[PDB]
Structures are given as C-alpha cells and as structure tokens.
Design a protein around this ligand. Structure first.
Ligand SMILES: [Cl-]
Ligand SMILES: [Cl-]
Ligand code: NA
Ligand code: NA
Length: 231
C-alpha cells in the first residue's frame, strides 16, 4: 500500500535549520510530483512548493522561496524539505502529499516546534467553526477572490482532516465524491462560490474541512472550518 511516512515532531532552536523527510513506498517515487504544505490554526493550509523526484525539478510558492529547499533522493525513495533561518513564524505542521485529486495521498505531517523560552486566489470559508447535533445538517461556504473554473470544470476540492488523522480528499472538482466517501456529503458551486453539505451528520464527521483551488498557481487553501458534534 502506498505510504508517505514523515517523523512526528522536531524540536528546534530559532536560527537553526531543520530537514524534514518524507519516505515513500508502494509506488514509483520518481514518477509523481510531491508537494509540501504548511498548516497553522490561523492561516489554514499553505502550499509551499513541489518537486518532481524523477529529475529534481522544483517549483516554489514565492512566499517560501528562501525559507524552503526541496530535494529528492531516488536511492532511498525519500523527499526532503529543508527549512532555514527558523523563527517562531515557522512553528507549524508540515505535510508531504500528492495533491492532484486523482493521485491524492498525504503523509501524517511533521510538527516543527521552534522553541525558545522567555493576485494569489484567496479562499474564504464561512463559518470557521460550528457545532451541529447528531442527524442535523452542516453547511459550509467557500468563496474565491477570482474564478476557479476552466472549460466548465471547477478546479476546487474539499479536504477533511479527522482528529489525529492525515487530511484526505473528500470532494473533487466542486461536486464529485472521492471513492469511499459516504453519500451524506455533497458539494455544489461554480465560478467563485462553493458549498459543502453534510446531512445527516454523524460522530465520525467531526473534522476540520479545507477548500483548495488549483486553477492558478500557487495552489491556495481556505483557513479551514472545524466541525464538532453538539451533544
Ligand atoms: Cl464566518
Ligand atoms: Cl478562511
Ligand atoms: Na520506492
Ligand atoms: Na459568512
């Protein structure tokens, strides 16, 4: 089975560098782009950049061009991201993943804790948290600053991250359920306005939901909506 294996934590000093690893297995490493993604409570998910391991070609989000360096080691099937000149602003969880929906695969993420004691498309989610009673309906909005559509398809996906689990694709291209996702989820929308619906909600649905667009570079995500069950 295909896996992206990342260490759990790194505890690091301001000013240091840290190298994160993503050990792949279960498929041909050189043949699929791998992406890295930063997660914080306030900013949701941020696309850092991507590497094609077959030849080492990289692309970086402008904002991370000096912070991150992506490499790949074909002999060990492992990708690495170096973060340099660490500051408090780097404390976050970092995931490696295959982001294209048809190849969706996520590592479990490495928490990097920097510790010292004393015209991109913007996606807006609404609400950013909600509690819903068992059997009732949750509805979440994602609005984009510019169209995410091309040729009648919406280049926008939703991701679910259940507590303690990696993110996974939930809905792709606005309205298609990923394999294995139950019929109680549905997605709608086009252009700049998209909606996730879950009804009837069950306990297993408690999670943080993120929208993402991949119509223009860089890929961008919403800040996330945390859904809990109202007891
Ligand atoms: Cl809101
Ligand atoms: Cl948001
Ligand atoms: Na391999
Ligand atoms: Na709103």
């Amino acid at each position: 089975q295909e896996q992206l294996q990342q260490p759990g934590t790194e505890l690091v000093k301001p000013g240091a560098s840290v190298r994160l690893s993503c050990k792949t297995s279960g498929y041909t490493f050189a043949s699929y782009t791998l992406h890295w993604v930063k997660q914080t409570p306030g900013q949701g998910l941020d696309w850092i950049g991507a590497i094609y391991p077959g030849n080492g070609d990289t692309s970086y989000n402008q904002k991370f061009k000096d912070k991150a360096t992506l490499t790949a080691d074909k002999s060990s099937s492992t990708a690495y991201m170096q973060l340099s000149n660490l500051t408090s602003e780097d404390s976050a969880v970092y995931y490696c993943a295959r982001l294209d929906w048809y190849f969706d695969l996520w590592g479990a993420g490495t928490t990097v804790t920097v510790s010292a004691a004393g015209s991109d498309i913007v996606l807006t989610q609404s609400p950013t948290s909600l509690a819903v009673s068992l059997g009732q309906r949750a509805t979440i909005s994602c609005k984009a600053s510019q169209s995410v559509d091309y040729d009648g398809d919406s280049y926008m996906n939703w991701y679910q991250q259940k507590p303690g689990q990696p993110p996974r694709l939930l809905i792709y291209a606005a309205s298609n359920l990923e394999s294995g996702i139950p019929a109680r989820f549905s997605g709608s929308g086009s252009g700049t306005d998209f909606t996730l619906n879950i009804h009837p909600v069950e306990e297993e649905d408690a999670a943080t939901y993120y929208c993402q667009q991949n119509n223009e570079d860089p890929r961008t995500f919403g800040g996330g909506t945390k859904l809990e069950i109202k007891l």
